[PDB]
Amino acid sequence: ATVYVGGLDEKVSEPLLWELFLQAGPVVNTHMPKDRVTGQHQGYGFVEFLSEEDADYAIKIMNMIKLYGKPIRVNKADVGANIFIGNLDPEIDEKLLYDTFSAFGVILQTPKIMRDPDTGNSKGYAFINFASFDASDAAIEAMNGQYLCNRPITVSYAFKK
Amino acid sequence: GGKTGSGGVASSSESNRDRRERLRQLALETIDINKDPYFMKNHLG
Amino acid sequence: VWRNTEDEILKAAVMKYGKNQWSRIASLLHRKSAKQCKARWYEWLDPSIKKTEWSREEEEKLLHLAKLMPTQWRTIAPIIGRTAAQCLEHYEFLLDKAA
Amino acid sequence: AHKKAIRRATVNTFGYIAKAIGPHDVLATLLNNLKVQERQNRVCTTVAIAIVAETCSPFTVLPALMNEYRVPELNVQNGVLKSLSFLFEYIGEMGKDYIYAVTPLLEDALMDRDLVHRQ
Amino acid sequence: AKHHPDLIFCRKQAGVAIGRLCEKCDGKCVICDSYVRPCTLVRICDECNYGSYQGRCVICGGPGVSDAYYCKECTIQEKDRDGCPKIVNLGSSKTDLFYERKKYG
Amino acid sequence: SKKKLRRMNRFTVAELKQLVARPDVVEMHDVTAQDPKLLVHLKATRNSVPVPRHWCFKRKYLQGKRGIEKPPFELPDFIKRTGIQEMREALQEKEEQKTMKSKMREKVRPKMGKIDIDYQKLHDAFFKWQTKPKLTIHGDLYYEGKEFETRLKEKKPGDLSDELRISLGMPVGPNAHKVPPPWLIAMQRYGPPPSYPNLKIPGLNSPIPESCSFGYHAGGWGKPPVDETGKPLYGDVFGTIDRTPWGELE
Ligand SMILES: [Mg+2]
Ligand SMILES: [Zn+2]
Ligand SMILES: [Zn+2]
Ligand SMILES: [Zn+2]
């Protein structure tokens, strides 16, 4: 029943946190046990919502939730660990893509489709940072060459800017 | 010697009200001069 | 008499105004005159006055003096460094502890 | 004064000269008195604001009372509360227009600022 | 008078004798101690109206000059229905001030 | 001791909680009442009002309210409109600049009619612009700290706010309905949260809220969920008497 609010926005108060937990499910406790001096939330928070499937679909919905604009992570309570991906589908979404590829590692970057500014359709390319380099190994090995959404995937550890 | 155009001299109530105000500014001063974190004025003065 | 509250308001006044403007300091207090504000500062509140216990040097002094100049406490006092009221009470004190 | 006849008559004449001139100026010099310290004068000014408000209709003097309740002193906040006590007893049945203006002040005072606030 | 808790009323049955006020006391209510909208007249107990007690201040006790009333608030809560509201005891304050004076001058 | 015989009478709390018809009502000390069956029956009567919380507290009541600092009273809107506030501010600052000399001087030579305020605005403010505040229903006693409770029992996702949507990166105002919160995307993706089978999503499980557009560019309502036959996944994402008051003024 316990959920980790990471990326908890510096000013997104327990009001916003538990008002989002209540709008999704039986919000029985949200808590930002925080820095005992600065008072600001800890960047890590513990929220209990009584139902396990409630917490599950809550974590499914609260990925990339933009508290104070920054995506707030809700889950179970930067060395270059990114995978770049070719042959991507233009029908893809970033939340759905995190839901798909995230089982090998959580989304330490939201999956950005490298798409032009002129039209707004994908070029078959993307990039997203996983948790670990071992996570990049697993993700890109179970997603390398296999059949993605529309175009069979092609993903490897990140080429950096 | 005096001067013309003046009002009188304040009665006890005005003199005591001004004394209390002066005593308040005094204490705000010395509280600063000791850089006292721990003092506050509440909404009843 | 004087209360801790008057005393602290005096200390603060003096520390702002200085030790020759007793009349405005006396305006700051209620039921107090400049004569009395001055007397209090120079009897008790001044941080030059020391409130310790008597070194036995100080007490042999006190006894020798209070015999050489009998009853003259404002004259005895500065020669030993405490106010005349302290010298006098402590002198009677030694006298009765010795009696 | 030590005599109650004098203070009663004094409050009445504040009413009369408020009837001659407008209310505003006498009412401003009366909120200033709520800045004094001895209670008998402040209780007598509290009855004088009630009278001014009842002669020249309450809608003239209420906003200034309700605003004076925002200055940070004990004695003036209790001055405007006691003044409303008197005023509502005087106007009697016409309270029904100002009851809604007033109540948000009273709940604010009944959540303490002092024992005397609640009293 | 709602001000001094140390005093007491006759409280015995009413009558027909109107009640009277001394000049110090003139104009106020007898329980509410107000100054306004007086509605009904006061009626006093026959015992507390007998003899020397005729025509006095219910409150003061001096020479009565005017008729006592009840404020509209006493009339609405029905506190005018309790029989003789005459204070039958002098209090501490009368004799107290009297003695302070008689010592002073 | 006959006191201890009365104590031998004193039911256990589970004794009480058993006999009475509503046990929730029974508190700890209820056992100590010279009439516990009465007491609990009277605590279970409709519309009655429970004793104030602070009868046992060792500190007194708002004496405990003590510590923090408080903002001054806040005037009603219909009284702000008349601008008495800034008027009296101006005079307060002037008189704080004044010194004792000038104060007595104006006591002796008043500046009559320095400033004024008009009637008919006070009259409109009391007899034509007044409003009923939010009142409390019967039985909501106040206690120390009631006013620092955000709210609760608000189980509904449709209830959005302004600070919420702002720090969500979503708009508040009249376009709130056409403004989708960050939850609707994964709502359409994997259902509503599984404590809220009975929540309907604006734009994902319910029709587009009026003048909002299904779409996947910035500001749209997506590709509405349906099955492989054409049946919506939750609700309908596409949107498939004489109540007159009886005696009322014209
Ligand atoms: Mg000259
Ligand atoms: Zn009388
Ligand atoms: Zn009465
Ligand atoms: Zn009688």
Short mmCIF file of N, CA and C in Angstrom, two decimals, chain A residues 12-156:
data_model
loop_
_atom_site.label_atom_id
_atom_site.label_comp_id
_atom_site.label_asym_id
_atom_site.label_seq_id
_atom_site.Cartn_x
_atom_site.Cartn_y
_atom_site.Cartn_z
N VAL A 12 5.54 21.36 -4.11
CA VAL A 12 4.29 20.62 -4.20
C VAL A 12 3.98 20.03 -2.83
N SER A 13 3.00 20.61 -2.16
CA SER A 13 2.77 20.34 -0.75
C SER A 13 2.07 19.00 -0.57
N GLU A 14 2.06 18.52 0.67
CA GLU A 14 1.19 17.40 1.00
C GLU A 14 -0.24 17.64 0.52
N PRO A 15 -0.74 18.87 0.47
CA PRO A 15 -2.07 19.08 -0.12
C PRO A 15 -2.17 18.59 -1.55
N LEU A 16 -1.25 19.00 -2.43
CA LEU A 16 -1.29 18.53 -3.81
C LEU A 16 -1.05 17.03 -3.90
N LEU A 17 -0.09 16.52 -3.12
CA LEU A 17 0.23 15.09 -3.16
C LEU A 17 -0.97 14.23 -2.78
N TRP A 18 -1.59 14.54 -1.64
CA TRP A 18 -2.71 13.73 -1.18
C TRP A 18 -4.00 14.06 -1.91
N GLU A 19 -4.09 15.24 -2.53
CA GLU A 19 -5.27 15.55 -3.33
C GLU A 19 -5.21 14.82 -4.66
N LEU A 20 -4.00 14.53 -5.14
CA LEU A 20 -3.86 13.65 -6.29
C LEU A 20 -4.06 12.20 -5.91
N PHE A 21 -3.55 11.79 -4.75
CA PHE A 21 -3.79 10.43 -4.28
C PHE A 21 -5.27 10.17 -4.00
N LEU A 22 -6.01 11.18 -3.55
CA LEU A 22 -7.43 11.01 -3.25
C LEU A 22 -8.26 10.98 -4.53
N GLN A 23 -7.89 11.81 -5.51
CA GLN A 23 -8.54 11.81 -6.81
C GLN A 23 -8.33 10.51 -7.57
N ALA A 24 -7.36 9.69 -7.16
CA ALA A 24 -7.13 8.39 -7.77
C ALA A 24 -7.66 7.24 -6.92
N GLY A 25 -7.62 7.36 -5.59
CA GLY A 25 -7.90 6.24 -4.72
C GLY A 25 -7.94 6.62 -3.26
N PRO A 26 -8.20 5.64 -2.39
CA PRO A 26 -8.50 5.93 -0.97
C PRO A 26 -7.27 6.42 -0.20
N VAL A 27 -7.00 7.72 -0.35
CA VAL A 27 -5.80 8.33 0.20
C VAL A 27 -5.90 8.33 1.72
N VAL A 28 -5.18 7.41 2.35
CA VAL A 28 -5.24 7.21 3.79
C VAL A 28 -4.07 7.87 4.50
N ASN A 29 -2.97 8.10 3.79
CA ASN A 29 -1.86 8.88 4.32
C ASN A 29 -0.96 9.30 3.16
N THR A 30 -0.62 10.58 3.09
CA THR A 30 0.54 11.05 2.34
C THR A 30 1.47 11.71 3.35
N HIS A 31 2.78 11.57 3.15
CA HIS A 31 3.73 12.19 4.06
C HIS A 31 5.01 12.50 3.31
N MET A 32 5.52 13.71 3.52
CA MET A 32 6.84 14.09 3.05
C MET A 32 7.74 14.22 4.27
N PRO A 33 8.23 13.12 4.82
CA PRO A 33 9.23 13.22 5.89
C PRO A 33 10.50 13.80 5.32
N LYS A 34 10.86 14.99 5.79
CA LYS A 34 11.67 15.92 5.02
C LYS A 34 12.94 16.30 5.77
N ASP A 35 13.66 17.27 5.17
CA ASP A 35 14.86 17.84 5.77
C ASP A 35 14.49 18.60 7.03
N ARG A 36 14.91 18.07 8.18
CA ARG A 36 14.52 18.59 9.49
C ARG A 36 15.02 20.01 9.78
N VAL A 37 15.57 20.70 8.78
CA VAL A 37 16.06 22.06 8.98
C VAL A 37 15.43 23.01 7.96
N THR A 38 15.63 22.72 6.67
CA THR A 38 15.08 23.54 5.60
C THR A 38 13.58 23.37 5.44
N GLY A 39 12.99 22.31 5.99
CA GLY A 39 11.56 22.10 5.97
C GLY A 39 11.00 21.63 4.64
N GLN A 40 11.71 21.92 3.55
CA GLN A 40 11.26 21.51 2.23
C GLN A 40 11.21 19.99 2.14
N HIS A 41 10.31 19.49 1.30
CA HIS A 41 10.12 18.05 1.14
C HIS A 41 11.44 17.38 0.80
N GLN A 42 11.54 16.09 1.12
CA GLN A 42 12.81 15.37 1.12
C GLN A 42 13.25 14.90 -0.26
N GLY A 43 12.50 15.21 -1.30
CA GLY A 43 12.75 14.59 -2.59
C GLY A 43 12.45 13.11 -2.58
N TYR A 44 12.04 12.61 -1.41
CA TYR A 44 11.53 11.27 -1.22
C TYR A 44 10.38 11.32 -0.23
N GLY A 45 9.28 10.66 -0.57
CA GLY A 45 8.09 10.73 0.26
C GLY A 45 7.37 9.41 0.33
N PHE A 46 6.69 9.19 1.45
CA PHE A 46 5.99 7.95 1.71
C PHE A 46 4.49 8.22 1.79
N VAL A 47 3.73 7.61 0.89
CA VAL A 47 2.28 7.78 0.84
C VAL A 47 1.65 6.40 0.84
N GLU A 48 0.80 6.12 1.82
CA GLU A 48 0.07 4.87 1.89
C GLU A 48 -1.37 5.10 1.41
N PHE A 49 -1.75 4.38 0.36
CA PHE A 49 -3.13 4.27 -0.08
C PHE A 49 -3.58 2.82 0.05
N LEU A 50 -4.66 2.62 0.82
CA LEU A 50 -4.95 1.33 1.43
C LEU A 50 -4.93 0.16 0.44
N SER A 51 -5.29 0.40 -0.82
CA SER A 51 -5.51 -0.68 -1.77
C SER A 51 -4.25 -0.92 -2.60
N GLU A 52 -3.90 -2.20 -2.77
CA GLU A 52 -2.71 -2.55 -3.54
C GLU A 52 -2.89 -2.22 -5.02
N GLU A 53 -4.04 -2.58 -5.60
CA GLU A 53 -4.28 -2.25 -7.00
C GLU A 53 -4.48 -0.75 -7.19
N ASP A 54 -5.03 -0.07 -6.18
CA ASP A 54 -5.05 1.39 -6.21
C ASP A 54 -3.65 1.95 -6.31
N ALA A 55 -2.74 1.49 -5.45
CA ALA A 55 -1.35 1.96 -5.50
C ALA A 55 -0.70 1.59 -6.83
N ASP A 56 -1.07 0.44 -7.38
CA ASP A 56 -0.51 0.01 -8.66
C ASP A 56 -0.90 0.94 -9.79
N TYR A 57 -2.20 1.15 -9.99
CA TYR A 57 -2.62 2.03 -11.08
C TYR A 57 -2.28 3.48 -10.77
N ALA A 58 -2.15 3.83 -9.48
CA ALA A 58 -1.64 5.14 -9.10
C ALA A 58 -0.21 5.34 -9.57
N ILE A 59 0.65 4.35 -9.37
CA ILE A 59 2.02 4.43 -9.88
C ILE A 59 2.01 4.44 -11.40
N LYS A 60 1.10 3.68 -12.01
CA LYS A 60 0.97 3.68 -13.46
C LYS A 60 0.55 5.03 -14.02
N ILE A 61 -0.19 5.82 -13.24
CA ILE A 61 -0.73 7.08 -13.73
C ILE A 61 0.18 8.24 -13.35
N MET A 62 0.91 8.10 -12.25
CA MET A 62 1.68 9.20 -11.70
C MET A 62 3.10 9.25 -12.24
N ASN A 63 3.47 8.33 -13.13
CA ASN A 63 4.70 8.49 -13.87
C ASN A 63 4.60 9.74 -14.75
N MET A 64 5.64 10.57 -14.72
CA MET A 64 5.70 11.81 -15.48
C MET A 64 4.61 12.81 -15.06
N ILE A 65 4.08 12.68 -13.85
CA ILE A 65 3.13 13.66 -13.34
C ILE A 65 3.88 14.95 -13.00
N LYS A 66 3.48 16.05 -13.63
CA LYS A 66 4.31 17.25 -13.65
C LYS A 66 4.07 18.19 -12.47
N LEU A 67 4.40 17.76 -11.26
CA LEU A 67 4.27 18.62 -10.09
C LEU A 67 5.26 19.78 -10.22
N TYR A 68 4.77 21.00 -10.02
CA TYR A 68 5.54 22.22 -10.27
C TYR A 68 6.23 22.16 -11.63
N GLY A 69 5.54 21.57 -12.61
CA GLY A 69 6.09 21.39 -13.93
C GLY A 69 7.04 20.23 -14.08
N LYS A 70 7.81 19.89 -13.04
CA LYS A 70 8.74 18.78 -13.17
C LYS A 70 8.01 17.47 -12.96
N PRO A 71 8.25 16.47 -13.80
CA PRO A 71 7.60 15.17 -13.62
C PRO A 71 7.88 14.62 -12.23
N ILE A 72 6.82 14.40 -11.47
CA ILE A 72 6.91 13.75 -10.17
C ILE A 72 6.78 12.25 -10.38
N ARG A 73 7.66 11.49 -9.73
CA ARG A 73 7.63 10.04 -9.79
C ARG A 73 6.84 9.51 -8.60
N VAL A 74 5.91 8.59 -8.85
CA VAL A 74 5.26 7.81 -7.81
C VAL A 74 5.44 6.34 -8.15
N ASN A 75 6.01 5.59 -7.22
CA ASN A 75 6.45 4.22 -7.44
C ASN A 75 6.28 3.46 -6.13
N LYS A 76 6.96 2.32 -6.00
CA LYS A 76 6.94 1.57 -4.75
C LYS A 76 7.96 2.13 -3.76
N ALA A 77 7.52 2.29 -2.51
CA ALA A 77 8.42 2.70 -1.43
C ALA A 77 8.80 1.52 -0.55
N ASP A 78 23.41 9.63 -13.15
CA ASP A 78 23.65 10.45 -14.33
C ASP A 78 25.08 10.28 -14.81
N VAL A 79 25.53 9.02 -14.86
CA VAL A 79 26.86 8.69 -15.35
C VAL A 79 26.81 8.50 -16.86
N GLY A 80 25.68 8.85 -17.47
CA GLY A 80 25.43 8.54 -18.86
C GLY A 80 24.63 7.27 -19.07
N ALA A 81 23.82 6.87 -18.10
CA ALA A 81 23.11 5.59 -18.15
C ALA A 81 21.84 5.73 -18.97
N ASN A 82 22.03 6.00 -20.26
CA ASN A 82 20.93 6.25 -21.18
C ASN A 82 21.03 5.33 -22.38
N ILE A 83 19.88 4.98 -22.94
CA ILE A 83 19.80 4.23 -24.19
C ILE A 83 19.20 5.13 -25.27
N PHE A 84 19.89 5.20 -26.40
CA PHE A 84 19.34 5.78 -27.61
C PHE A 84 18.74 4.67 -28.46
N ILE A 85 17.73 5.02 -29.25
CA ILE A 85 16.90 4.03 -29.92
C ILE A 85 16.63 4.48 -31.35
N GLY A 86 16.86 3.59 -32.31
CA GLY A 86 16.50 3.83 -33.68
C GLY A 86 15.33 2.96 -34.11
N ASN A 87 14.80 3.27 -35.29
CA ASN A 87 13.66 2.55 -35.87
C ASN A 87 12.45 2.58 -34.94
N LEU A 88 12.20 3.75 -34.34
CA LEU A 88 11.06 3.93 -33.46
C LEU A 88 9.80 4.19 -34.27
N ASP A 89 8.65 3.98 -33.62
CA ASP A 89 7.36 4.23 -34.26
C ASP A 89 6.90 5.66 -33.96
N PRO A 90 6.35 6.35 -34.96
CA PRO A 90 5.80 7.69 -34.70
C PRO A 90 4.46 7.66 -33.97
N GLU A 91 3.85 6.49 -33.83
CA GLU A 91 2.62 6.31 -33.08
C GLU A 91 2.86 6.15 -31.58
N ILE A 92 4.09 6.33 -31.12
CA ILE A 92 4.46 6.03 -29.75
C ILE A 92 4.20 7.24 -28.87
N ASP A 93 3.97 6.97 -27.58
CA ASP A 93 3.87 7.98 -26.53
C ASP A 93 4.96 7.73 -25.50
N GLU A 94 5.27 8.77 -24.72
CA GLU A 94 6.39 8.67 -23.78
C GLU A 94 5.98 7.99 -22.49
N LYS A 95 4.75 8.21 -22.03
CA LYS A 95 4.22 7.51 -20.86
C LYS A 95 4.08 6.02 -21.16
N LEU A 96 3.45 5.71 -22.30
CA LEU A 96 3.35 4.32 -22.73
C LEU A 96 4.73 3.70 -22.97
N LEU A 97 5.70 4.50 -23.43
CA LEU A 97 7.03 3.97 -23.68
C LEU A 97 7.76 3.69 -22.37
N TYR A 98 7.56 4.54 -21.37
CA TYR A 98 8.09 4.26 -20.04
C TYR A 98 7.43 3.02 -19.45
N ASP A 99 6.13 2.86 -19.66
CA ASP A 99 5.44 1.66 -19.19
C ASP A 99 5.99 0.42 -19.87
N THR A 100 6.36 0.53 -21.15
CA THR A 100 6.87 -0.62 -21.87
C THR A 100 8.30 -0.96 -21.47
N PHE A 101 9.24 -0.04 -21.67
CA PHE A 101 10.66 -0.31 -21.45
C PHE A 101 11.07 -0.27 -19.99
N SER A 102 10.20 0.20 -19.08
CA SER A 102 10.63 0.50 -17.72
C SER A 102 10.85 -0.73 -16.87
N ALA A 103 10.44 -1.92 -17.32
CA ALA A 103 10.57 -3.10 -16.48
C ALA A 103 12.03 -3.49 -16.29
N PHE A 104 12.89 -3.12 -17.24
CA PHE A 104 14.33 -3.29 -17.07
C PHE A 104 14.97 -2.16 -16.27
N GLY A 105 14.22 -1.10 -16.00
CA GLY A 105 14.70 -0.01 -15.17
C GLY A 105 13.76 1.17 -15.24
N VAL A 106 13.67 1.88 -14.12
CA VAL A 106 12.75 3.01 -14.03
C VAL A 106 13.20 4.12 -14.96
N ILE A 107 12.34 5.11 -15.17
CA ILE A 107 12.57 6.17 -16.14
C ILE A 107 13.29 7.32 -15.45
N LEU A 108 14.62 7.33 -15.57
CA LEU A 108 15.41 8.48 -15.14
C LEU A 108 15.57 9.49 -16.27
N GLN A 109 14.94 9.24 -17.41
CA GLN A 109 14.60 10.26 -18.39
C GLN A 109 13.29 9.84 -19.05
N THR A 110 12.45 10.82 -19.33
CA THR A 110 11.21 10.54 -20.03
C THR A 110 11.52 10.32 -21.50
N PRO A 111 10.95 9.29 -22.14
CA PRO A 111 11.48 8.87 -23.44
C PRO A 111 11.21 9.88 -24.53
N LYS A 112 12.25 10.60 -24.94
CA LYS A 112 12.12 11.72 -25.86
C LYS A 112 12.33 11.22 -27.28
N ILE A 113 11.33 11.42 -28.13
CA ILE A 113 11.41 11.07 -29.54
C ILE A 113 12.12 12.19 -30.27
N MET A 114 13.23 11.87 -30.92
CA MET A 114 14.02 12.85 -31.66
C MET A 114 13.29 13.19 -32.94
N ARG A 115 12.37 14.14 -32.86
CA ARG A 115 11.48 14.49 -33.96
C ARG A 115 11.66 15.97 -34.29
N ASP A 116 11.56 16.28 -35.58
CA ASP A 116 11.86 17.62 -36.07
C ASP A 116 10.87 18.64 -35.53
N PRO A 117 11.17 19.93 -35.68
CA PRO A 117 10.22 20.96 -35.26
C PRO A 117 9.28 21.39 -36.38
N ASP A 118 9.63 21.02 -37.61
CA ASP A 118 8.88 21.47 -38.78
C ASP A 118 7.47 20.88 -38.81
N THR A 119 7.37 19.55 -38.78
CA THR A 119 6.07 18.89 -38.89
C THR A 119 5.57 18.36 -37.55
N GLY A 120 6.42 17.71 -36.77
CA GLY A 120 6.02 17.14 -35.50
C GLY A 120 5.84 15.64 -35.50
N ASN A 121 6.21 14.96 -36.58
CA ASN A 121 6.21 13.50 -36.61
C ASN A 121 7.60 12.98 -36.30
N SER A 122 7.65 11.74 -35.80
CA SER A 122 8.92 11.16 -35.38
C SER A 122 9.81 10.86 -36.59
N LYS A 123 11.12 10.84 -36.35
CA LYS A 123 12.09 10.47 -37.38
C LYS A 123 12.55 9.02 -37.26
N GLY A 124 11.91 8.22 -36.41
CA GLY A 124 12.39 6.89 -36.11
C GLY A 124 13.46 6.81 -35.05
N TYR A 125 13.66 7.87 -34.27
CA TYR A 125 14.75 7.92 -33.30
C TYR A 125 14.24 8.47 -31.98
N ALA A 126 14.95 8.11 -30.90
CA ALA A 126 14.56 8.50 -29.56
C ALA A 126 15.72 8.27 -28.61
N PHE A 127 15.53 8.68 -27.35
CA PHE A 127 16.53 8.51 -26.31
C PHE A 127 15.86 8.63 -24.95
N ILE A 128 16.37 7.85 -24.00
CA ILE A 128 15.85 7.89 -22.63
C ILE A 128 16.90 7.27 -21.72
N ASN A 129 17.08 7.87 -20.55
CA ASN A 129 18.03 7.37 -19.55
C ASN A 129 17.29 6.40 -18.64
N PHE A 130 17.84 5.19 -18.51
CA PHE A 130 17.33 4.19 -17.58
C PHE A 130 17.94 4.44 -16.21
N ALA A 131 17.78 3.47 -15.30
CA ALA A 131 18.41 3.58 -14.00
C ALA A 131 19.91 3.28 -14.05
N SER A 132 20.29 2.11 -14.57
CA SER A 132 21.67 1.65 -14.51
C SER A 132 22.21 1.36 -15.90
N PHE A 133 23.53 1.15 -15.97
CA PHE A 133 24.14 0.65 -17.21
C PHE A 133 23.83 -0.83 -17.40
N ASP A 134 23.78 -1.60 -16.31
CA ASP A 134 23.22 -2.94 -16.38
C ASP A 134 21.76 -2.90 -16.82
N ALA A 135 21.04 -1.85 -16.42
CA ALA A 135 19.68 -1.65 -16.89
C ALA A 135 19.65 -1.38 -18.39
N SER A 136 20.61 -0.60 -18.88
CA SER A 136 20.71 -0.38 -20.33
C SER A 136 21.01 -1.69 -21.05
N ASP A 137 21.91 -2.50 -20.50
CA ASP A 137 22.19 -3.82 -21.05
C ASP A 137 20.92 -4.66 -21.17
N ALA A 138 20.18 -4.81 -20.07
CA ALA A 138 18.95 -5.61 -20.10
C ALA A 138 17.91 -5.03 -21.05
N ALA A 139 17.60 -3.74 -20.91
CA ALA A 139 16.58 -3.12 -21.75
C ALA A 139 16.91 -3.26 -23.22
N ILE A 140 18.12 -2.85 -23.62
CA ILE A 140 18.48 -2.86 -25.03
C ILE A 140 18.73 -4.26 -25.56
N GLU A 141 19.02 -5.24 -24.70
CA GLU A 141 19.17 -6.62 -25.16
C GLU A 141 17.82 -7.31 -25.35
N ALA A 142 16.84 -6.99 -24.51
CA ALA A 142 15.51 -7.53 -24.71
C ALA A 142 14.66 -6.70 -25.66
N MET A 143 15.17 -5.54 -26.09
CA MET A 143 14.48 -4.70 -27.06
C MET A 143 15.28 -4.44 -28.33
N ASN A 144 16.41 -5.11 -28.51
CA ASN A 144 17.28 -4.86 -29.66
C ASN A 144 16.84 -5.70 -30.84
N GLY A 145 16.51 -5.04 -31.95
CA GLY A 145 16.09 -5.72 -33.16
C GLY A 145 14.70 -6.30 -33.12
N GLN A 146 14.11 -6.46 -31.94
CA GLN A 146 12.78 -7.04 -31.83
C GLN A 146 11.73 -6.08 -32.38
N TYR A 147 10.52 -6.59 -32.54
CA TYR A 147 9.45 -5.88 -33.22
C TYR A 147 8.80 -4.89 -32.26
N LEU A 148 9.08 -3.61 -32.45
CA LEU A 148 8.51 -2.56 -31.62
C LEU A 148 7.08 -2.26 -32.07
N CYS A 149 6.55 -1.13 -31.60
CA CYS A 149 5.16 -0.75 -31.87
C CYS A 149 4.78 -0.93 -33.34
N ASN A 150 5.45 -0.19 -34.22
CA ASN A 150 5.24 -0.34 -35.65
C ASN A 150 6.51 -0.72 -36.40
N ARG A 151 7.66 -0.17 -36.01
CA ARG A 151 8.93 -0.46 -36.68
C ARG A 151 9.80 -1.26 -35.71
N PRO A 152 10.24 -2.48 -36.08
CA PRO A 152 11.10 -3.27 -35.20
C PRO A 152 12.19 -2.45 -34.54
N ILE A 153 12.34 -2.61 -33.22
CA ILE A 153 13.14 -1.67 -32.45
C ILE A 153 14.62 -1.79 -32.83
N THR A 154 15.38 -0.76 -32.47
CA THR A 154 16.83 -0.78 -32.52
C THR A 154 17.33 0.20 -31.48
N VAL A 155 17.85 -0.31 -30.37
CA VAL A 155 18.19 0.49 -29.20
C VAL A 155 19.56 0.09 -28.69
N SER A 156 20.37 1.08 -28.32
CA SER A 156 21.69 0.83 -27.76
C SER A 156 22.02 1.94 -26.77
#
